[PDB]
């Protein structure tokens, strides 16, 4: 049975970049609704004895949509933190300069891909099978877990992620996303 | 060069069902941006000088996404009116009872399809090639104009359509949608 993971910080710790009101709806209502819907859709099926990741890799339709959204939002909350943001250091900055030239160029390309992701979706920094990093965008509940790439960083661009704080200005939301990035989480994902 | 069509009522005329603030962003920022983006993408191409419906039926990619969203939102604003709503009469009521058994059964099936439409999209009452009426949901900018069915009525279920007024409660939005339906516009589309 799946439970909503506790949030890694206080609901107002990401302010002013993401308000406490966005967390109360996005985590308290949207992420909770996907957990409840997944639990009710899998009760009594063979999916009930699988890990979340195996459910994402072996389902379709409603089960997939809710299971991938439960995982995608837990990953997303961990990519954000108070007193973080800025430019990365260590193995992460190395790997970013290696695949994208510099941090300024990666930041440009990720922002651009997130702004152009039409409709509801997610834009990801992934490490491919071959070790090079790439920027991938998915639509709706799509996730890199259905491929051989390893997820490193994500930004939710479903309109509920930013409409309370930024209304139609998804560019304003992405500018402020950079002030919250938890580079420690990214570094752990890169080393796995 | 396409122009944003004027709204056929004042900005505050759907209140309290859809607020003046929601149409200030949805019409004044979102629908306007689709027209500006479409004009920028077709300038100097063979699409310039074609009508909006011909562009929708013959393109794909960003040209399609923006052209179809311009048409979809103008159709949506024409589907809503002050001093309307309630149950249809006449020809529309007869066709709805003939394909769905009753107006209550149609309203319940349209509300169900609209709430379940995952992600961004639109839910439509269409008149099929054989004269029967059906409910179809599309994703992102998808529209029945790319098929053989005639659009009669639509509801926008992109989150920007309701998030200011209803936050995550898309059921509440749909309940209030029914108080705004302009059955004179549905009647014009039915015998088209
Ligand atoms: Fe989300
Ligand atoms: Fe819209």
| CB within 8 Å of A42: residues ≥ 6 apart | A48, A55, A63
Range A12-32 burial, b when 16+ CB lie within 10 A, else e? ebbeebbeeebbebbbeebbe
- How many Å apart are CA B154 and CA B143, to the nearest integer? 10
Supply φ then ψ for residue A89, to 5 degrees: -135, 180
Whether residue A164 and residue B159 make contact (CB cut-off 8 A), yes or no, is: no
For residue B16, say if its preceding peptide bond is cis, omega within 30 degrees of 0.
Answer: yes
Question: Would residue A101 be called left, alpha or beta, if left means φ above 0 and alpha means ψ between -120 and 50 degrees?
Answer: left
Residues 34-63 of B with CB under 8 A from A: 62
Range B30-65 burial, b when 16+ CB lie within 10 A, else e? bbbebbebbeebbeeeebeebeeeebbbebeeebbb
Determine contact, residues A67/A56, Cβ cutoff 8 Å.
yes
Query: For residue B105, what are its two tokens?
Result: 């059964």
Query: For residue B121, what are its two tokens?
Result: 């999209």
Whether residue A160 and residue B164 make contact (CB cut-off 8 A), yes or no, is: no
Q: Which ligand is nearest to the CA of B70?
A: 2
| CB within 8 Å of B169: residues ≥ 6 apart | B162
Q: Which ligand is nearest to the CA of A31?
A: 1
Query: For residue B40, what are its two tokens?
Result: 């920028």
Whether residue B163 and residue A159 make contact (CB cut-off 8 A), yes or no, is: yes
User: Cα–Cα–Cα angle for B142, B145, B148, nearest 5°?
Assistant: 120
The minimal CB distance from A168 to the residues B140, B160, B167 is found for B160
Query: Residue B168: which of A65, A29, A121 has the closest Cα?
Result: A29
Residue B158 touches chain A, beta carbons under 8 Å: yes
Determine contact, residues A21/A164, Cβ cutoff 8 Å.
yes
* Residue ranges with strand state E in B24-91: none
Q: Which residue on chain A is closest to B34 by alpha carbon? A: A118
Whether residue A163 and residue B158 make contact (CB cut-off 8 A), yes or no, is: no
Give the DSSP H/E element, type plus range, for residue A133: strand A133-139
Most B CBs within 10 Å, among A29, A41, A60, A168, to test the B interface: A168
The minimal CB distance from B140 to the residues A33, A118, A158 is found for A118
Query: For residue A1, what are its two tokens?
Result: 């049975």
- How many Å apart are CA B64 and CA B56, to the nearest integer? 6
Q: Which value in Å is the resolution of this experimental model?
A: 1.8
Q: DSSP string covering B131-176, please?
A: S-EEEEEEETT--GGGTTSEEEEEEE-SGGGTHHHHTT-HHHHHHH
Question: Scanning the structure block, which residue is given the tokens 């059921």?
Answer: B171
Determine contact, residues A177/A169, Cβ cutoff 8 Å.
no
Strand order in the sheet with A150-156: A133-139, A121-127, A150-156
Question: Would residue A112 be called left, alpha or beta, if left means φ above 0 and alpha means ψ between -120 and 50 degrees?
Answer: alpha
- Report helix, strand or coil for A180: coil
Q: How was it solved?
A: X-ray
- In this structure, the strands spanning A150-156 and B133-139 are unpaired
Give the DSSP H/E element, type plus range, for residue B127: strand B121-127
B26 annotated as a binding-site residue: yes
Determine contact, residues A88/A183, Cβ cutoff 8 Å.
yes
Instruction: Give chain A's radius of gyration (CA, Å).
Output: 16
Residue B33 touches chain A, beta carbons under 8 Å: yes
Most B CBs within 10 Å, among A60, A120, A141, to test the B interface: A120
Determine contact, residues A56/A68, Cβ cutoff 8 Å.
yes
Query: Residue A36: which of A13, A62, A10 has the closest Cα?
Result: A62
Determine contact, residues B84/B182, Cβ cutoff 8 Å.
yes
Residue A32 touches chain B, beta carbons under 8 Å: no
The minimal CB distance from B163 to the residues A118, A120, A163 is found for A163
- How many Å apart are CA A4 and CA B187, to the nearest integer? 47
Query: For residue A106, what are its two tokens?
Result: 């990666």
Q: Which residue on chain B is closest to A65 by alpha carbon? A: B118
User: Cα–Cα–Cα angle for A74, A80, A84, nearest 5°?
Assistant: 155
Residue B139 touches chain A, beta carbons under 8 Å: yes
The burial of B67, by beta-carbon neighbours within 10 Å (0-12 exposed, 13-18 middle, 19 or more buried), is given as: buried
Strand order in the sheet with B121-127: B133-139, B121-127, B150-156
- How many Å apart are CA B112 and CA B122, to the nearest integer? 13
Determine contact, residues B174/B80, Cβ cutoff 8 Å.
no
Determine contact, residues B124/B137, Cβ cutoff 8 Å.
yes
- How many Å apart are CA B54 and CA B112, to the nearest integer? 32
Q: At what angle do helices A103-116 and A170-177 cross, to 10 degrees?
A: 150
Q: DSSP string covering A4-48, please?
A: PPPPSS-TTTTTTTS-HHHHHHIIIIIIHHHHHHHHHHHTTSGGG
Chain B contact set for A164 (CB, 8 A): 163, 167
- How many Å apart are CA B125 and CA B101, to the nearest integer? 15
Query: For residue B113, what are its two tokens?
Result: 């399809």
């Amino acid at each position: 049975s799946f439970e909503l993971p506790a949030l890694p910080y206080a609901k107002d710790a990401l302010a002013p970049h993401i308000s406490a009101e966005t967390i109360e709806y996005h985590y308290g209502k949207h992420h909770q609704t996907y957990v409840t819907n997944l639990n009710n859709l899998i009760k009594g099926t063979a999916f009930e004895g699988k890990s979340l990741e195996e459910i994402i890799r072996s389902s379709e339709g409603g089960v997939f949509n809710n299971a991938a959204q439960v995982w995608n939002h837990t990953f997303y909350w961990n990519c954000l933190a108070p007193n973080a943001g800025g430019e990365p250091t260590g193995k992460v900055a190395e790997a970013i300069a290696a695949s994208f030239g510099s941090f300024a160029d990666f930041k440009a390309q990720f922002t651009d891909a997130a702004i152009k992701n039409f409709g509801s979706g997610w834009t990801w920094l992934v490490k491919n099978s071959d070790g090079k990093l790439a920027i991938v965008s998915t639509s709706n509940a799509g996730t890199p877990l259905t491929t051989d790439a390893t997820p490193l960083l994500t930004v939710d661009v479903w309109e509920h992620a930013y409409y309370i704080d930024y209304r139609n200005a998804r560019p304003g939301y992405l500018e402020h996303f950079w002030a919250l990035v938890n580079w420690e989480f990214v570094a752990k994902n890169l080393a796995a």
